[PDB]
Point group: D2
Chain length 144, copies 4
């Protein structure tokens, strides 16, 4: 449920993960810096603390709390309570992260008010919430 990869000062390219999704709970992806700030989170919520099939993007500093939430239409959660393999890739952009899933671009996310790269840790977290089918991680990836 927790694993991660730790990379050389990544000021370009993209990280990516492949996982089997879960019917409940959520699957978050963390993009830390050296200060251990959160340059970005990608929180896909399958069935979480009240909401289904919701995608959240945010960023905080280590010590302070969260910023304005981003919910973008386009994340391929399955309907019907199903589960499938999802590919998510995060591109390290010039003016921001660019997120896509299963090869289809979800959204551009400009770097938060003084929180630019490099990314140095990339982290997958699954948090269960009573899931009949738990998430399964297949792969973590840095691209150059």
């Amino acid at each position: 449920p927790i694993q991660s990869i730790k990379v050389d000062p990544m000021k370009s390219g993209g990280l990516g993960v492949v996982y089997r999704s879960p019917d409940k709970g959520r699957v978050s992806l963390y993009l830390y810096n050296d200060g251990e700030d959160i340059l970005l989170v990608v929180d896909a919520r399958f069935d979480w603390r009240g909401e289904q099939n919701v995608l959240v993007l945010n960023s905080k500093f280590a010590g302070g709390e969260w910023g304005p939430e981003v919910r973008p239409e386009g994340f391929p959660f399955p309907c019907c309570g199903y589960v499938t393999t999802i590919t998510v890739r995060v591109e390290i952009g010039a003016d921001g992260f660019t997120l896509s899933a299963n090869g289809i671009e979800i959204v551009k996310y400009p770097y938060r008010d003084g929180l630019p790269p490099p990314v140095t840790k990339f982290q997958y977290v699954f948090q269960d919430q009573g899931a009949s089918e738990t998430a399964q991680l297949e792969s973590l990836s840095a691209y150059y």
Copy 2:
């Protein structure tokens, strides 16, 4: 919208399509033989004539009637109006077909009485409802 490949008689192997899904309408996969009998159709109904996110399997002779329709679950229909990229593979068994989507098995279809392989056609058909994102086909593939 309508595309196919003609193989050499396959009795062993598998077939694969890759496409971006539509928000409405349906996407059908026809496995024919010589006589243009449907050994199996895989009808992914995203929104079609009053069904949402419905997987239909079945078979009919060339100019015959449909058999009883199998309705499996586990098909990565995106929630909430979305479109994603789908990967679908059918393994041509010695028993029946084995259906998969995104590296995940959905169901076993024992061939219908009188409709064994050889398969010689693999067909893609998309049929529009009122979809704002029509499906676009990517790849058609035989596996040996």
Copy 3:
């Protein structure tokens, strides 16, 4: 050893094969039309009739003569007797074909005078010399 797919008239798109190579012999890719003219053959000679690791492109009418033979370089022929997995794709241009192996372009073949697309057959043929590892074909693929 010998396998193919029949497409709908492709004038736009690409075709793909994936195979494990042999140590000796050759592997040819034929792009036919209706009249069974060779719009293009891609003849990878691993050891064939006194050529080692030789890439031959060419075209002939159905019951006609070969044209002048193009001999490109850059084809991932394994060294030292080895077998590997090859990925070959041909893009059906508006100019000619674009040849690729393992995500890498090898050459541009402007269609031969009188042999434009539509392509309707994509054929794989392996011909043994004295190879201790015969080639085994994996996938045949049209791209749209």
Copy 4:
């Protein structure tokens, strides 16, 4: 020419890299532990300090020098002075690392005399030796 990924205590699974090979020089892959020992190196030598198209596997402790060298037949170096995309995956086995390339297994390598996992850093190094076509890294990967 140098990049690497740093992983959670990997006692199973496999690491992998995708690169564009170089016409000369060599491309080494390092599997370190926490002591910064070398659990394994995978040195593919395209054109190195006297030899062509040679594959070397070894392991040392941090302070002492190398062990017995392993050269396994099967690495897909290109002939002819060419370059192509190579996929190498290293599986973290029960009794050893298991190496394959382009989906074809090269060899089992049992853990060196008291040098078992976990792996914690995975590292790509290209060292040039007058190369007309330098290696290009595409991706580093941990598999679970």
